């Protein structure tokens with residue numbers, strides 16, 4: 001009953017049998033090797049054990065499979081990593097994210113205002129995807145009318161990450177990066193001459209051990225912040241809201257008592273796990289949870305598998321917004337623990353609260369059909385989500 005899986009095949013993460021493959025992994029081979037020999041930490045304990053040893057499980061070989069390291073902080077180890085983190089993390093603390101609550105809240109109602117009179121919308125296209133793009137776009141200095149453009153580039157950069165990608169879809173990826181690279185490098189120059197307060201200008205004026213960053217790194221550190229912002233939270237928003245709709249009792253709980261929202265957000269994060277994996281590179285041969293790992297090979301941290309680990313969670317296949325503690329690993333753990341985790345939790349809190357309040361009779365358009373997941377091996381979620389609701393007036 002061993003699953004036949006290629007953990008770099010995007011089709012695996014779009015199939016609804018992925019979690020049954022995870023369950024076999026956790027019970028039979030905690031450090032799993034897929035049909036091509038790729039190692040993966042499948043249990044909560046194995047993921048945590050690897051995260052706690054960056055000296056042995058390094059990021060400096062790149063976070064993706066079949067992909068060399070890039071000049072971004074997530075592909076670095078300390079000290080180099082933490083020097084980069086400290087340059088841009090000031091605005092991402094819990095307190096500094098709270099100062100954005102007012103502006104994030106109005107972006108939410110602006111987006112709901114645009115569909116609330118129609119009685120129908122695509123939850124992904126019209127609500128889930130545009131919120132975080134506007135939030136991180138504002139922090140990156142992206143003009144509001146340039147938001148769909150950056151979202152389109154972002155989609156093209158992550159949608160076709162798969163071991164079985166066609167040469168043409170791969171062309172879409174390198175095209176999107178080239179277009180993103182041209183735009184950003186012109187923005188590099190404008191921020192050099194005329195500095196601003198956006199994160200790009202903070203990056204341009206930064207120095208590490210006395211020297212400024214290269215344009216190659218500046219372009220990639222900006223892209224890391226962009227994709228982290230606009231290709232992650234959107235999937236918890238849509239997938240988590242789907243679970244509230246497929247389990248109406250949870251949706252009813254949240255309206256009857258809005259104080260349950262923070263717990264609902266944590267369960268949406270655990271369930272959806274938008275970042276399906278991150279790679280680590282072994283710096284030496286080791287024995288890890290009974291599996292022999294060789295120096296130089298990559299191992300995937302399977303965050304969704306860890307989030308449904310029965311050794312940690314009671315009844316992990318139940319969607320339960322009252323789960324507490326909910327020590328999920330959607331944001332990872334350790335050195336590279338998500339820098340935007342507080343920002344994503346506030347985006348989720350505010351948009352969900354207004355969906356529940358302003359679209360109170362929300363339901364899926366077709367409860368009997370299943371919504372398609374994105375067949376990619378890095379970030380993945382609902383491709384679309386047609387919903388219907390009783391129309392109301394904008395604010």
Ligand code: HEM
Pocket residue numbers: 051073074075085132136224225226228229230232233234236269273274275278303329330331332333334335336337338339340341343344
């Ligand atoms: C629900 C949404 C999100 C999820 C699931 C998520 C998940 C993750 C994960 C799994 C990692 C790697 C952690 C590890 O390997 O230990 C990560 C890192 C990161 N995330 Fe997020 N993230 C989310 C939202 C955001 C947002 C809104 C931003 C803001 C720009 C962001 C920026 C980053 C950055 C910059 C890193 C790399 C930080 C580092 O290497 O130290 N993420 N995220």
Ligand SMILES: CC(C)CCC[C@H](C)[C@@H]1CC[C@H]2[C@@H]3CCC4=CC(=O)CC[C@@]4(C)[C@@H]3CC[C@]21C
Pocket residue numbers: 064067074157158173174177223224225227228232275379
């Ligand atoms: C979810 C976040 C925390 C992590 C984001 C990691 C970065 C931004 C992502 C991860 C996978 C990367 C892509 C890897 C494949 C490709 C090869 C190139 O020739 C340069 C551009 C690239 C097109 C892409 C650069 C941006 C990458 C998309």
Ligand code: NA
Pocket residue numbers: 053054055057058059077280335
């Ligand atoms: Na590491």
